[PDB]
Amino acid sequence: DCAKEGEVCSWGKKCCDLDNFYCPMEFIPHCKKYKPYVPVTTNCAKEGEVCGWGSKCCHGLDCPLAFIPYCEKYR
Amino acid sequence: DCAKEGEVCSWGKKCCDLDNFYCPMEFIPHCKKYKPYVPVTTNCAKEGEVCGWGSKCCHGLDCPLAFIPYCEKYR
Amino acid sequence: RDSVGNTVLHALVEVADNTVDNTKFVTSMYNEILILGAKLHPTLKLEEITNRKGLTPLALAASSGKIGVLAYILQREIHEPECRHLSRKFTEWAYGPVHSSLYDLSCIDTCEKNSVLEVIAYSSSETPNRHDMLLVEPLNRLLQDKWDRFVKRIFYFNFFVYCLYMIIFTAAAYYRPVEGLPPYKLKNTVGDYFRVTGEILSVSGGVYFFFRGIQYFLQRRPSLKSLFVDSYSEILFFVQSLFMLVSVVLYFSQRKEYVASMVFSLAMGWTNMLYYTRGFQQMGIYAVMIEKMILRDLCRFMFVYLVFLFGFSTAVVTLIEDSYNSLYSTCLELFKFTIGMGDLEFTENYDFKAVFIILLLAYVILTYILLLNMLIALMGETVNKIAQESKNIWKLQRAITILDTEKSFLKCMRKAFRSGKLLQVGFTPDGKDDYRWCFRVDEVNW
Amino acid sequence: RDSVGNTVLHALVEVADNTVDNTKFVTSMYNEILILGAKLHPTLKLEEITNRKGLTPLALAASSGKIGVLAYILQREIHEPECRHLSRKFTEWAYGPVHSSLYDLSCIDTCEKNSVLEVIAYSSSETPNRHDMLLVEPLNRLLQDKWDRFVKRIFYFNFFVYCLYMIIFTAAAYYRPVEGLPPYKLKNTVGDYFRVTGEILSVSGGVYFFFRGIQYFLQRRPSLKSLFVDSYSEILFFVQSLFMLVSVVLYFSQRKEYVASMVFSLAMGWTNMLYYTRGFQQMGIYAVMIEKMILRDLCRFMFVYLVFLFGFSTAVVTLIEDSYNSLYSTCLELFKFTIGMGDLEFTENYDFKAVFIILLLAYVILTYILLLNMLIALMGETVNKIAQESKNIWKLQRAITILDTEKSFLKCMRKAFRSGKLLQVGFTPDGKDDYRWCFRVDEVNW
Amino acid sequence: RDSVGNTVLHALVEVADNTVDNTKFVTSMYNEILILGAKLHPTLKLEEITNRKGLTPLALAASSGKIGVLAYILQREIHEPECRHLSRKFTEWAYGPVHSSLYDLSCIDTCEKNSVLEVIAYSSSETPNRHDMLLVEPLNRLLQDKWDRFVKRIFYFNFFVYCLYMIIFTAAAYYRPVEGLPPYKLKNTVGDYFRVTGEILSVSGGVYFFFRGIQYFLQRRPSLKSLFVDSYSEILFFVQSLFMLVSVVLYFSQRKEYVASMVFSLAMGWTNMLYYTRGFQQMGIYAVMIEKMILRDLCRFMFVYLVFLFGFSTAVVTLIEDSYNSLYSTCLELFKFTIGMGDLEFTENYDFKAVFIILLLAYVILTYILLLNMLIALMGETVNKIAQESKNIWKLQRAITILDTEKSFLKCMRKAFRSGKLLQVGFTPDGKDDYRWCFRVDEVNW
Amino acid sequence: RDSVGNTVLHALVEVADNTVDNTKFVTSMYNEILILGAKLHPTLKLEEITNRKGLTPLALAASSGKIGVLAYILQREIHEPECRHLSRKFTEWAYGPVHSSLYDLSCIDTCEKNSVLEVIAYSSSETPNRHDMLLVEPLNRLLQDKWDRFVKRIFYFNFFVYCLYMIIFTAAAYYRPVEGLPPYKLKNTVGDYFRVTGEILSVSGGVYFFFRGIQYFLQRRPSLKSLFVDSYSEILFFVQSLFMLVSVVLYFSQRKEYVASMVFSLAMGWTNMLYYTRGFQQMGIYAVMIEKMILRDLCRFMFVYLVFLFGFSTAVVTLIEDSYNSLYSTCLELFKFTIGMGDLEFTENYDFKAVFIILLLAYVILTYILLLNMLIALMGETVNKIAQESKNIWKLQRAITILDTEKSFLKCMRKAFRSGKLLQVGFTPDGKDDYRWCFRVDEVNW
Numbered sequence A, B: 001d002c003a004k005e006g007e008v009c010s011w012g013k014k015c016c017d018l019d020n021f022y023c024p025m026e027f028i029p030h031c032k033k034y035k036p037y038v039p040v041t042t043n044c045a046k047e048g049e050v051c052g053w054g055s056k057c058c059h060g061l062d063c064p065l066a067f068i069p070y071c072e073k074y075r
Numbered sequence C, D, E, F: 001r002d003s004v005g006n007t008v009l010h011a012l013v014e015v016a017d018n019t020v021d022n023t024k025f026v027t028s029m030y031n032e033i034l035i036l037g038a039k040l041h042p043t044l045k046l047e048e049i050t051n052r053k054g055l056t057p058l059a060l061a062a063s064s065g066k067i068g069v070l071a072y073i074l075q076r077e078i079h080e081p082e083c084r085h086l087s088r089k090f091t092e093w094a095y096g097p098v099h100s101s102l103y104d105l106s107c108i109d110t111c112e113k114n115s116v117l118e119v120i121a122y123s124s125s126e127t128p129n130r131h132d133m134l135l136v137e138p139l140n141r142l143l144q145d146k147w148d149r150f151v152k153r154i155f156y157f158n159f160f161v162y163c164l165y166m167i168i169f170t171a172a173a174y175y176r177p178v179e180g181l182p183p184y185k186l187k188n189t190v191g192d193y194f195r196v197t198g199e200i201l202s203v204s205g206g207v208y209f210f211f212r213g214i215q216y217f218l219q220r221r222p223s224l225k226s227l228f229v230d231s232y233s234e235i236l237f238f239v240q241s242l243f244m245l246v247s248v249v250l251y252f253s254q255r256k257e258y259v260a261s262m263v264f265s266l267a268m269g270w271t272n273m274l275y276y277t278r279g280f281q282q283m284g285i286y287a288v289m290i291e292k293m294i295l296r297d298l299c300r301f302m303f304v305y306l307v308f309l310f311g312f313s314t315a316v317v318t319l320i321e322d323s324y325n326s327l328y329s330t331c332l333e334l335f336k337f338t339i340g341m342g343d344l345e346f347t348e349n350y351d352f353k354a355v356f357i358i359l360l361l362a363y364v365i366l367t368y369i370l371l372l373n374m375l376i377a378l379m380g381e382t383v384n385k386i387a388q389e390s391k392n393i394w395k396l397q398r399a400i401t402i403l404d405t406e407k408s409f410l411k412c413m414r415k416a417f418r419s420g421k422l423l424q425v426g427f428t429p430d431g432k433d434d435y436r437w438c439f440r441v442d443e444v445n446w
């Protein structure tokens, strides 16, 4: 049988329901339940603003790889 | 403009319709059309027979990795 | 005749070039001249001659690295009646293989102008024997005993204090609040009070290091040409202080970019802890090797590698036009190829692919196999070069560490003297007695 | 005058420092003094002086490594009447290039206190020349003949037995049952009986090694400061025994974790087989090189590397906040970067990405190119340093291996003596005869 | 007797082999012969002998590497009354350690046929002491003073001009138009005018280098056997010029393949900048090491590696039949395995998989571990071999750089002479005065 | 007295140990003994005495490595009236530095039992001076002339033929038919005729090599202990022949597995082409470094590595139970880790993961960093060990290559003799004339 939530996994036991629980890699694996993927909140940068130096861009566009990036909508 | 079938591609031109044509890596890329994925023909080995030394196994079963493999039903 | 009022002894110090027969000549001339002076005008001391730089013959011999002179002038020994008041070495007990010599130690600890230790240890890294000049018996044993007596308690204490400071800094940094727009209002929970205390201690450490660095730079006056050859450690500590101060300035400016500064300080905050490994017999070499490799090697190889990288980078970026979408990304990709971490995929849809492959293969062969292993051969040569001399280097690294601490000492006591106002020497043309802070040392030599 | 009843020969052994002129000095003094003592009081043997440690002058010479004393004191050859009862070497046949010398063998095999071999081979690894002391003709040839005669039958037999033990252990371990909650009830099938037999044999081996280690540690009494410099092999075998015993204890405690212990023992169970490669002329070097590299190198480099790892790890983990989700994972990732296996992906959605990249590039340059190849250069120097000594090193590996086996001897035999109670020497001030277990050895030297 | 009208001094230059006693022999012979010639026919100069190659004894001694003869013949110093017009060295002021000698400098800079510099620096890389022959004092001082006086302003200027040319070329290349079918019609916007200007400048540079290379090849006349051993730099610059010209030819031919040529030129356009690092005291080594490694090593290792690559490539391609679909792809895959970048996946559905694996493991062991590290050991040997001696090579790198520039000098002045038509020598059997372009040099030697 | 009918010269050859004074002693003994023998019994030749091995004193000196005896016995030069028929060296023309010496050549090419060449070049790689013994003048000049005169025309021709053979074989491999169940019925198209021709030629080559190898093994009779130390090349060629024959046997047995044999032969068919690289002054060395490194290094390191691999492999495979699904796959995975190609993924769902990680990290540290670089340092030592001896080494490669070819000669040629039954020596105790096939050699030595 497997371990339950909060119990130590990976030293002699795995945790059940991989679609529900996962065993993290921290040298003392207490397995935990997943969390929903919340959307992006406020304070994201808008198009044309410098990104990657103090803040990420909103989910509607990408931040390219360069020394001083500027975000652009994907096209 | 792109190159047509049989023309030399990748030296100054790519060929069109990547879903139909591809530019092979042979140092003189004559662009060619794809081929259908034909199924496995006869003379494939069956379960319990030695595989990988003189013949492959049929599509319905798998050949493990070992010094003297024996094929088994894929499960 | 003379140039700037130099004595004959001074000119002889200038002329001496550490040859054995020139050493004999200069030493014999010193013996005869000093005895003549003692016979003619035994009225005042003449060894402390001033100059435009204020250098005594001992001071100049120390400065220029005239080791052959220091071998003699610090160990004068003679029995000439009426002229025994210029001897430095004496004897009390004597046996077959072992002799308990008595060494004069004046003008080494408190000369008030520029001691011998203050010149050998503070040389400009051009003197060829600065690592050996401290191996003379009086200075060598003096430093050994000063180390054994009290210095260790201060050094280990300093090391412990610094380690605690860095642990506190790391703990404070790790638990920073997540919400934006500093400064943040503390709550009455205990965690906030601990975090605020940690931050305050961290800033205090930063300020302290800033002022120590400024004091050192004002006192030493580096040339700006050998600024980095010597004084590496103060430079790094000062750089840490600058980053910490920039971080706090941004923090109170209502900008969230301060973290970008802070982490850099945090990184150095650990790394330069290697400074305290100097002074250990074995584990100290791994600091000086890094210093030499990072200064006197990569500032030369940098040019060659950058030329290759930039040339091929612009070639690839202009060849393909329509991930190598920009100069920066391609520079990163070829850098990854240099150190064997990259991968050669050869995707589709690049025009001129057959030339692209040839360029990449030429680049990989030129950089990864040929150039890099050349660099490795040179670094191997450097590492083996100082496998042996490191022992003497360690001695130097010991000595300087003492001289900074002992001079400071931070307790306003005067326990640094070896022993005694010993009157058993008491030699003078007058009827009076005298002392020279003499030290009894057993030499076992047969 | 003396300190603790030491004889003049004893003090001269202390004074000697293996210099050629001092060697001649002490040699001539020993010759004259021994002759005079033999003539004055031919009543009892004086070479077996008692002491606080019960140490003879030849035992002291062996202990301190005064090879010059051993070269003579074990090689006395004289025929002068009234002092013929202290000779150690004789001759029977003689030719031009070859001489059939006759050597006394006392104080080497059965002295009952501290033989010559029992001190040279069991020295504390500070003697500068212990690798050469066994090259003297009597000891060298005695060890050679003892090896050729009977020792090999025991050594190869031991090696075979150990190999069988490890094969049985591996087989028993591989086929453990899968269902949980030990201990497990056996079935009447043959496979279960074989498995139980294998387990029983494995535990028996573990217990045996445990007790052998206990006996060795009680008899040798290591200092706890040079515990790991010498006696490495017993330490590893004992560690294996501890792991096996912990495994069986957990097994009977109704826990599944015993496998976590067992496999560790299993790993060492194979690796320690390298011990038996000592004693082969060529293949033995690959053991001593590993011992030196793993002890006297990485225990130093460990701290220097760890500073970099921990500093950059905390920097990266505190920079990114919201796969680097914890300190442990980031420590692993940077470790993977160190040895060229990792990969630099630079995925999206990290804030402060532009600083993250600079930190990682600095880390890769600092660790992968610069520091690691420095370590490699040092290890290259270490292995080249003992390419030349390999012959002499191997001799030590032979000698100790014999002394443990013949001491143990495993069969209640007494065949250690070379040959004969030969009465042909028979020298004594009395009218009686005597023997010294003399050994005829041909020396071919011209 | 003689062969081609050679003088006795000429035969002595031929016979001399730089042995010390042969040096004394030819020296004394020269002294006596010159004195006799001065006494017999003091009517005309006899040193300017013609020959089939037009070599004087000085010229031949310089050509053949007879350093022992140059050591004397360029520093004749003698007081022989009535025959004082054969001396080259004189003195005006003299002190203990320092002497202000007066050196004759004639026939070194303007001899109008073949000076000593013009054959020492233009030797065929078989002369054994060409790296030291420039250390004779008159030559050494001429080169040092000519460097310090005016040459540097031209060299640094050249370097700056080349750097500007490469920057302009890169900028012009980066912004090429994207639409097909050159040549392209310019618009009246400013960007097009700048682009056209950049292209015109780039082509002009290419043409200039082409003609300079042709002139060099016509004047030097290389053997076609040592074509690549010397004159590496001209070869590379000429190759750049060829690629640029092919690019422009294709450009006006209404073909889009010109970019494939252009980028290749662009790559070399950066890389050849390393040539200008020659002449720096420290950073010059990284050019000569690359030249030596890339010429005299890989042209040998190439065939040995290629045998393995081709053999295993054909083996794998014929084993699997029905991503290794062709010979080219498999050659690339095994090349990736050679340098540790590849990956061993072992996918399914290959027949004979069990043999495929054995072949690949044999290949990886044979190439990656064994052969490649052999190559690395040889390159390490090469790098350490010339870590030290190349200091002298740097002198050669200085000297040749001067001789090309001063020869041209591009300003139509004649200020290369050191100083003066100094008449203070004025020695001749006639009653007249004379000058030898003498220069005063202070030598400090004791 | 004597043992087996040996002459005094025989005993002197045996006793000689290449010491300078022993060389003088044996030399003078030979001079006196030869003079006495010539005077006592001028009736028959006695220097060419046979023995049980059929070895003359010249032959025995060559066999045992007594280079000092070869230095004299091959170059006897004496004017002893009535005994001038024992001289080997003479003179015709003489000048100051150059002498046109005349050397006897008998018993080197046609001795009909055992020539000097046939034992000096066929030594068992234990002779200490085999690299120098062929540098004695007569042998050296013989080999040089034989190379320059006619031998090259064969060797290069041979190389070409072999290369041609391999190309045909490769083509015959590449275009094999795809349908199963050999043998296959040919069609009347031209391609089938070409393929059949290629196959026939390939099998003929295989058979030829098989018989050549058998002939060599029967003629040479290797010891079975130094089988692989020498005769490496014949072993590899013979192995190729075996694989080809097995392939054809399977081909006619109606099995598809013949391809599995054929490709292996094909691989060696290319790889051992490096045999013909021997004999080139520069490119030859890259062959010998393989021969040592693959034999006298990895047959030792194999066991040390395998212990680690097997131990950790079984540990991991027994730890995880329920891709590491079997012992073989895990062995491959850890092998991939050894050479830096693998990846540490740490997927989910393994129980005992926390111990799995520790085991893998221990393995990576132990193998990749520590052990492998130890192997690399040892190979670096080996490579630098024979960088210097290459000049001698290649000479051996020349000599043996000649001796096999000229002895075989392949065309009924008899050009081995230099020139003439030259009667100008004609020395004999009789009144007759004689010839010794003498060789006129100019020696320039002063």
Ligand SMILES: C=C(C)[C@]12C[C@@H](C)[C@@]34O[C@](Cc5ccccc5)(O[C@@H]1[C@@H]3C=C(COC(=O)Cc1ccc(O)c(OC)c1)C[C@]1(O)C(=O)C(C)=C[C@@H]41)O2
Pocket: D232, D233, D234, D236, D237, D239, D267, D268, D271, D272, D274, D275, D287, D288, D290, D291, D294, F359, F362, F365, F366
């Ligand atoms: C000395 C101790 C206590 C030691 C015990 C363990 C943990 C050990 O790692 C070390 C430290 C270490 C840590 C990480 C990587 C490598 C080594 O070295 C040995 C110890 C070291 C090794 C490797 O050393 C050897 O090659 C064995 C050996 C060589 C030469 C000998 O003469 C010898 O004598 C019997 C044994 C084997 C281990 O026990 C092993 O199998 C694993 C998985 C770890 C090794 O700790």
Ligand SMILES: C=C(C)[C@]12C[C@@H](C)[C@@]34O[C@](Cc5ccccc5)(O[C@@H]1[C@@H]3C=C(COC(=O)Cc1ccc(O)c(OC)c1)C[C@]1(O)C(=O)C(C)=C[C@@H]41)O2
Pocket: E359, E362, E365, E366, F232, F233, F234, F236, F237, F239, F267, F268, F271, F272, F273, F274, F275, F287, F288, F290, F291, F294
């Ligand atoms: C000596 C034997 C019997 C040998 C036969 C085969 C298996 C061999 O591997 C070895 C062992 C081996 C195993 C794994 C990796 C490398 C080598 O070495 C040779 C043998 C070794 C090689 C490599 O050696 C060479 O470079 C050939 C060579 C070099 C120098 C020579 O003077 C020479 O003389 C003809 C030949 C070629 C192989 O036959 C080959 O092509 C493959 C795939 C394996 C090589 O076994």
Ligand code: NA
Pocket: C340, D340, E340, F340
């Ligand atoms: Na790598």
Ligand code: NA
Pocket: C380, D380, E380, F380
């Ligand atoms: Na190296």
Ligand code: NA
Pocket: C341, D341, E341, F341
């Ligand atoms: Na990889």
